[PDB]
């Protein structure tokens, strides 16, 4: 047989065109690593051979060299186009030791075993925003308040990154409602004075309580510095707690320096629904202490405890509790206690 | 070592004088005493070398062998068990190095002094192998030779037995062809049968109805059951059938055509049984190319698409319209404008009752053939068949829902 | 042939210059070897201090103290440390690299816990970074105070001056510059603290005039601060430790509401040995997986300083929801000392650590109340690591509990079942499938329960990664009977009858075959459905049409290979159920009939809608029943 | 008062021996900047060879070759280097930091081109880190041969006389240590100068006589082996070359049998600019996401040389795939340099690269054949990034081919679903199916054609994803026909005629409902199909079928909430369906009839069975069918 050009298709493997037909021997060295593979592989690249087609010379080199040659499947390992071949190599003294490994002769190949899990993401449900849930549901005037606190931790935090827009549409925030039944603010906040990212929240405090919004019907929209009429609340029903009631009263004041900061009312809402009210408590039983965090960490452990209902409770918890200084963190407390100072 | 143990005090049949075949079992199990050879088993065997070697295979779990034929040759040491070996009986064996699956045998898969040697549970242990057409199951008395496989069309030097079935039966020792039984009235399942038949190859048959003269009834011989037949064939030699790779263009016409009058014969004589081969053979003719002047590839194409006819009504005469099926969608994939054939397929289709495929087929056919009614009216009789099924469902399925309501108290 | 032998030279602007802007990569560095340099001091002393009972006296307190000035900028800290003579001061100092700490401590003789932080001799030309000037007046011990000046000009010197004693007074101020004028922000001062340093065994502090000038009203007349409100409990002898100091230690780790839910402590004593401290949470982590990065585990905290910690290296993808700290004091570090050299050990450090909390889980697992608790709620970072850790799989089997026939209500150890063995069953029976009701209520799982044989009922998802990879386990295999085989050893007389119902209904095989075209390769009489006439079962070797809808359903993984793959289907019948035997009726009669093909049609399909299998086209099933319920119409 | 002003002193032995083992944690960076002098020394005296001809007149030579000498262990280089004068060699050398190659660099008035790579002045004395000691032997211009002498141990010197001329002999013999002996191995050294410095226009190679030892016989004696191989594409400018120069590089590059798709150039002119030069393969990338060893595959150079590459930093997760080469010759450094100081640089520059790589996909999209070609293989890839990208959705958009009821055949732009004939209730309507037929069959699906507008098919377990981040692509927005709403603008008598039916069939449905409980919220009168009696629509919010089956059964994904929750169910009717019709007459006047009740059971199952939902238990409905079969049996 005459031999065709010799270009390489493959680390032994060259296709060559015998003088029109066809040949390549991708050949098996027999004290290689992957010889093993190369051996086998044989059989993948010899899936294809008909039925007579491997005449393999059985001296010493093996007769089931060429036994078991032969296909059982069709799991295309790289290719099927293979007709004929043969076992074309040192064919004397090609090994000083070789153990003639014979065994297992009649196992295959279990797909590669390629079952690695890619790598998972998931995804943020965004079907929804505010005015829609809002409607479409009213949640617990505490876990109502609780939302809140995600629209003016962003308040707090996006005017933390300085920057600032005057007035926040009403449906200004999207509300992923991930897992049904509980709305949530973006964390993204793409949609876009001091305070009056606070003040917006503070106008959509009303939506959520489902009472009618003055800043609406009643006026002086789009302004924070814009006031009239002392800033009426309109909320009649008592289901809002009068304590929270004094801290909205506190809410929309003469001056934004008497009006809190984002984060004092995070600080607030952190103290309000975490923490805890007590007659012990009461009389503003905290003071300067480092290790109280702990104490009151302790004190909204029991957000999983009374009212956990909605499981989202625990999930934001986490990026709370961790965060949190003394420095911005008593004076709310302090205001918080003027609820009480209610006498 | 067990089997060194077992082998003292055994009475051995040994082909060489130190190689052979060794009568070792423990206990024996019940079974037939005359000695049987049976393809069909399914034995439960221990392959452990023991005495200072391991054989971790087959050892684990009993498997059952498929054994080829009396001689088989997939494992040497099998066979040798089956020398003198009884059916639901039990069996031992011994090691024999010449022996080994893998033809001679390389020491680390066979110890070179020890072959596989296993605790053998003879189970039912007769019979050779089977038809996959049925009627016959592999009678023999002589070994083939793998050189001298008959071939379609060849004719063929067959000495017959003299009684059938147990009854002595007319006939001579006539130079039989595929096509050629049917004519002088013998088991007809021979074309299929001489398939296994060699050169110097003895084979009594069995044939049953279905695959010979049985099922066809028989005037001349004189045969009480015709699913009982049993009788003996003597192939003395044969000639080869010119094939593929063996016939020409030219001669490939030349039997076309012969072929094709032949048909014409078949027809008029109506018997078909033996057109399904010789019609398949044709078609195996065209179904390559010739890479020769083909002018009229046309009428070659043509005495095959007649071919397909005739096959397709062959298959409506008798058969279960699958192989009629094949038959016109090998001629649609050719000519699918036959005048008759596609009708045929779709009268097989209404006849198989699929009347919605035979409609569509049909009104092709009357594009077509705006000409005659048979097709017209076999569409209507689809319409009939399909009103049929319609009243079948609505019958079995009045309310069917009440009677569960019935089962509530 | 001469030799003009000399010593190495050197150059020092550009050397400096180069330790400045290129050994470490951030500003943020500082404020951490200050603290080194004070600590080693300190401690020094202190041992100096208990041999003599006058330096015991004047070194009194011990404190280290920072103060940013504010406006003024001029940051600084403070130690109580003992110093350096006026020259030797230099002789350390402007000797880069020449620590004295090192020298004296390796001066001497009955080094008890030394544990020097620093011995590189490059922290304090670190301060050059933020730095304009570094000036830093001291005194020692019996000696004068002495103003150290630099600002990295190439030279220094020493001016006395009578700065306020402040008594030992051990302390550098800090002029940064205008531009990069950071780290004046306190509570970045905080989380730097708390990112490193926040483990010191010597007392720590700030202090800021912050208030509130509320004119009295103001809650606080000055802000003094401590931060190190934390002890290492490694340190700390384990068995020894104090009562209930591991749940006060987790919420000062970390900031968790919750407590702990157990915690080990392993005393290493390897060549190169440490002190392992692992918890686990008594909770699940709302926050994981979602993070790509790998995030933090294990702390390593060698020297009783952070380190690089919260990498891979140290433990597995898997159970990386882990959390404890690590420490051996001796560990080859770098001059940023950031990055490791050797990550060899990093590989006997992590076997060491999974070994360990491995048995941690073991122990665990000898409780079974809080045991099955967290079981519940971890069992899938569980599989997943029993199916990627290939090497240990005694150790990772015999902790899982699942569903069974035998008690549905409580979670059944695997070995709890292997110990049943029922009949010498060597093969342990499960399923994998979607709904609990659903396992329950499955053919071969039917017939499994007339066999008596239990059947562990898995319903989790992620179980199919994991059983794949899991075997035979103490001696015996898994089996799924939803498996083509399901080989079970019946009565002799009942494989003989059951055979002779195959020998007189594979005919009928064939006959529905006939209409079965193109869906299923063998049709068969089964040993396994007893309830149902007929079912479909997966085939030897492929996906279960569950493990199948995983395969396909996990995202990212569509192929040209995926497009078409794992084709093995087929089905069965019960030759003992009335429609069964109704069906073999007939059948004989007509090989062809639409009914007996619509029939084979829905039935075939309705068991593909059984096996889990999603209905190939749905479609098409409605509108045959749709046709159905049109019957039903009297139509 | 008095000023003590001193510069800053050092000491040597610690310091270097500090600087051995603390610089660096990979052993094997010595063989580089050996490579990074040779190289700059070499470079230099060419710019003043084409200067002056007189050094290169005797060189005439640019090799460079590696002599490991396993017989005596003597590893060595040996360049064409013009070296220093015996005392200026000392003047650079001993001077640790003092970079004679960056003095006269500096000193170089017309710097064309100059690119040193080494600047920092310790890459020398890497190699006690494996020499045991260090002797160098040189010659320079017009000067005399100088065997340099060293072994870290403080010292140096010079003692050498009738050595080998070998011309200028600019090499450097190495002595590792019996311990840690690696590095004789040649296959080792060429993953490591594949791994590093395979890019230098400068001729390199090793000698070495391996051989067959077959006493010839044996084809070559020596083993003189170049290792440049491939030259650097990148530094010559682009449009000035073919496709095959980067096709045979790519070639050279990552060795695959196959050849490139794409690739494209980039000249950056910024005040940091570079290299820019990405390919896209030809092929889709086997084996990937295991995340083993690889977040990217791009590489970047500085100087002409080997980087630190592959850091999720300038290359974001999505279109991780993407391969190619940056290079901008001068970036801050480290020490080890490994690591990088600033990041923000990283930003822009990924910034560039995902602008110009986007750009790049764009171009392809300009053509339709191999653009389809490679979106086939890679959309997945792209969805991702669409959906992580989350700022230029815009163009993210554009590239999307998609088979619709306009297509059919093949896939095609969303740009070819907007530009509409009918120009009415522009919205995109789509539907995330399974199989293209079972997407194809829905009565909802139907009725759109029987509108008239087309309908692109969304057929993908990841395409979900994408559809939620996706939203109003081209001022018009998308609308899956599934949603609850499906708002469609029909005719007045349409619209009124369909709600009079609603409102003598709000009844009906009332009355269904009274069977109906438990399962769905809001029954009612539906337009949204035709030609099928009933079907399922999901509500507004929530999962659709095809949504909320991935969810359960992707990877680690169970929870309290994957559990159960997203729950949201409702069907309608076919008012003109003849079916629907018939369980409307007479239902108010049957009372508890099971005939109804059971029929509309089996209806809404057959629905949940289309609209995708998994049959919620399927045993049942093969229990209701096999009643109905039993039925078919006379029974």
């Not at chain 1, 295309?76 to 076992?87: D, E, G, K, M, Y």
């Not at chain 3, 304090?124 to 990295?152: C, G, M, P, R």
């Amino acid at each position: 047989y005459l031999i065709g050009q010799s270009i390489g298709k493959g680390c032994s493997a060259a296709v060559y065109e015998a003088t029109p037909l066809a040949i390549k021997m991708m050949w098996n060295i027999s004290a290689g690593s992957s010889s093993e593979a190369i051996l086998n592989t044989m059989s993948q690249e010899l899936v294809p051979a008909s039925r007579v087609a491997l005449a393999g010379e059985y001296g010493a080199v093996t007769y089931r060299k060429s036994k078991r040659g032969p296909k059982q499947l069709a799991p295309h390992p790289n290719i099927i186009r293979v007709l004929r071949a043969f076992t074309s190599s040192v064919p004397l003294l090609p090994g000083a030791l070789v153990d003639y490994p014979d065994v297992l002769p009649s196992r295959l190949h279990p797909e590669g075993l390629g079952h690695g899990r890619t790598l998972f993401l998931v995804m943020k449900n965004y079907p929804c925003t505010l005015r829609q849930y809002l409607c479409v549901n009213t949640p617990s005037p505490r876990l109502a308040a609780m939302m809140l606190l995600q629209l003016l931790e962003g308040v707090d935090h996006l005017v933390q990154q300085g920057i600032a827009h005057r007035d926040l549409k009403s449906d200004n925030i999207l509300v992923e409602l991930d897992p049904d039944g509980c709305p949530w603010l973006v964390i993204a906040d793409f949609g876009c004075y001091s305070k009056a990212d606070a003040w917006a929240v503070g106008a959509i405090a009303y939506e959520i309580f489902g009472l009618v919004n003055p800043f609406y019907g009643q006026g002086k929209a789009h302004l924070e510095s814009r006031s009239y009429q002392e800033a009426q609340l309109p909320a009649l029903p008592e289901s809002v707690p009068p304590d929270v009631r004094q801290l909205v009263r506190a809410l929309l004041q003469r001056e934004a320096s008497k009006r809190p900061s984002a984060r004092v009312a995070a600080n607030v809402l952190h103290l309000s629904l975490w923490g805890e009210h007590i007659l012990a408590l009461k009389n503003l039983k905290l003071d300067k202490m480092v290790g109280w965090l702990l104490q009151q960490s302790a004190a909204t452990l029991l957000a999983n405890r009374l009212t956990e209902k909605c499981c989202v409770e625990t999930k934001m918890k986490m990026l709370f509790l961790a965060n949190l200084e003394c420095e911005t963190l008593c004076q709310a407390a302090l205001l918080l206690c003027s609820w009480r100072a209610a006498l | 070592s067990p089997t060194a143990t077992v082998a003292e005090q055994g009475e051995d049949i040994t082909s060489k004088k130190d190689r052979g075949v060794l009568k070792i079992v423990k206990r024996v199990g019940n079974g037939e005493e005359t000695p049987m050879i049976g393809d069909k088993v399914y034995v439960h065997y221990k392959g452990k070398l023991s005495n200072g070697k391991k054989f971790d295979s087959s050892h684990d779990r009993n498997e059952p062998f498929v054994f080829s034929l009396g001689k088989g040759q997939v494992i040497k040491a099998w066979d040798i068990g089956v020398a003198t070996m009884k059916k639901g009986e039990i069996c031992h064996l011994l090691c024999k190095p010449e022996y080994a699956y893998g033809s001679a045998g390389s020491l680390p898969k066979i110890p070179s002094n020890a072959t596989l040697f296993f605790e053998i549970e003879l189970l039912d242990f007769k019979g050779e192998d089977l038809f996959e057409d049925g009627g016959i199951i592999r009678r023999t008395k002589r070994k083939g030779e793998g050189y001298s496989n008959p071939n379609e069309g060849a004719t063929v030097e067959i000495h017959l037995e003299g009684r059938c079935g147990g009854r002595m039966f007319d006939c001579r020792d006539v130079a039989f062809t595929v096509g050629e039984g049917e004519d002088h009235d013998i088991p007809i399942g021979i074309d299929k049968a001489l398939e296994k038949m060699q050169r110097e190859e003895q084979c009594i048959l069995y044939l049953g109805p279905r695959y010979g003269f049985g099922e066809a009834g028989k005037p001349k011989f004189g045969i009480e059951p015709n699913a009982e037949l049993i009788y003996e064939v003597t192939l003395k030699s044969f000639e080869k059938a010119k094939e593929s790779w063996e016939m020409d263009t030219k001669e490939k016409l030349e039997q076309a055509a012969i072929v094709k009058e032949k048909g014409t014969v078949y027809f008029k004589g109506g018997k078909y049984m033996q057109a399904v081969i010789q019609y398949g053979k044709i078609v195996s003719w065209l179904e390559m190319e010739y890479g020769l002047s083909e002018k009229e590839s046309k009428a070659s194409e043509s005495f095959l698409l007649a071919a397909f006819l005739n096959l397709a009504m062959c298959y409506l005469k008798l058969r279960e319209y699958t192989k009629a099926v094949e038959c016109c969608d090998k001629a649609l994939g050719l000519d699918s404008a036959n005048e008759k054939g596609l009708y045929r397929r779709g009268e097989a289709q209404l006849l198989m009752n699929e009347f919605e495929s035979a409609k569509g087929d049909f009104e092709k056919v009357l594009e077509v053939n705006p000409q005659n009614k048979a097709a017209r009216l076999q569409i209507s009789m689809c319409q009939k068949k399909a009103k049929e099924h319609n009243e079948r469902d609505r019958r079995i399925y009045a309310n069917m829902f009440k009677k569960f309501a019935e089962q509530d108290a | 042939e001469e030799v003009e032998t000399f010593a190495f030279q050197a150059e020092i602007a550009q050397l400096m210059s180069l330790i400045i802007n290129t050994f470490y990569s951030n500003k943020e560095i500082f404020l951490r070897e200050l603290i080194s340099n004070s600590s080693d001091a300190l401690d020094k002393i202190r041992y100096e201090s208990l041999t003599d009972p006058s330096k015991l006296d004047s070194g009194k307190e011990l404190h280290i103290n920072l103060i940013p000035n504010k406006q003024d900028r001029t940051l600084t800290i403070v130690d109580t440390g003992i110093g350096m003579t006026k020259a030797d001061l230099i002789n350390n100092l402007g000797t880069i690299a020449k620590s004295g700490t090192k020298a004296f401590m390796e001066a001497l003789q009955a080094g008890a816990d030394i544990s020097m932080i620093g011995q590189f001799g490059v922290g304090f030309y670190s301060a050059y970074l933020v730095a304009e000037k570094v000036t830093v007046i001291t005194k020692h011990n019996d000696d004068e105070q002495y103003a150290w000046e630099s600002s990295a000009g190439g030279s220094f010197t020493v001016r006395t001056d009578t700065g306020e004693p402040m008594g030992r007074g051990t302390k550098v101020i800090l002029h940064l510059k205008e531009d990069q004028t950071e780290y004046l922000e306190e509570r970045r001062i905080k989380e730097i603290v708390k990112k490193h340093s926040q483990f010191i065994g010597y007392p720590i502090t700030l202090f800021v005039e912050k208030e509130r000038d509320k004119e009295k009203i103001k809650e606080k007349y000055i802000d003094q601060e401590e931060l190190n409100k934390t002890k290492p409990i490694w340190t700390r002898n384990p068995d020894d430790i104090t009562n209930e100091e591991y749940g006060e230690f987790y919420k000062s780790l970390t900031n968790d509401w919750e407590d702990h839910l157990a915690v080990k402590h392993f005393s290493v004593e390897g060549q190169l040995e440490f002190r392992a401290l692992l918890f686990v949470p008594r909770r699940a982590p709302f926050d994981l997986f979602e993070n790509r990065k790998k995030k933090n585990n294990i702390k390593l905290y060698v020297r009783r300083v952070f380190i690089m910690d919260n990498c891979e290296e140290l433990i597995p993808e898997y159970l990386n929801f882990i959390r404890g700290v690590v420490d051996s004091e001796d560990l080859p570090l770098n001059i940023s000392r950031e990055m490791l050299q050797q990550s060899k050990i990093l590989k006997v450090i992590r076997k060491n650590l999974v070994k360990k909390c491995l048995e941690l889980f073991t122990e665990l697992a000898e409780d079974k109340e809080n045991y099955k608790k967290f079981y519940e709620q971890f069992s899938k970072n569980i599989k997943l690591g029993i199916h990627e850790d290939s090497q240990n799989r005694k150790k990772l089997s015999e902790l899982l509990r699942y569903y069974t026939s035998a008690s549905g209500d409580e979670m059944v150890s695997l070995k709890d079942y292997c110990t049943r063995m029922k009949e010498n069953q060597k093969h342990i029976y499960y399923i994998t499938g979607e709904t609990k009701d659903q396992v329950a209520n499955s053919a071969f799982v039917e017939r499994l329960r007339k066999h008596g044989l239990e059947v562990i009922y898995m319903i989790e998802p992620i179980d199919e990664y994991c059983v794949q990879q899991l075997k035979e386990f103490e001696g015996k295999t898994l089996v799924s009977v939803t498996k083509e085989g399901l080989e079970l050893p019946e009565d002799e007389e009942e494989k003989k009858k059951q055979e002779e119902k195959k020998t007189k209904f594979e005919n009928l095989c064939k006959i529905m075959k006939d209409i079965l075209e193109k869906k299923v390769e063998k049709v068969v009489v089964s040993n396994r459905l007893v309830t149902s006439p007929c079912c479909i079962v997966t085939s030897t070797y492929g996906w279960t049409a569950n493990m199948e809808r995983i395969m396909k359903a996990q995202a990212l993984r569509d192929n040209s290979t995926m497009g078409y793959m794992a084709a093995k289907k087929h089905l069965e019948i019960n030759p003992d159920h009335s429609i069964i035997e109704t069906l073999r009726q007939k059948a004989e009669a007509d090989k062809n009939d639409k009914s007996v093909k619509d029939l084979v049609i829905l039935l075939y399909e309705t068991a593909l809608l059984s096996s889990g299998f999603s209905l190939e086209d749905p479609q098409t099933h409605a509108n045959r029943i749709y046709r159905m319920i049109k019957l039903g119409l009297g139509i």
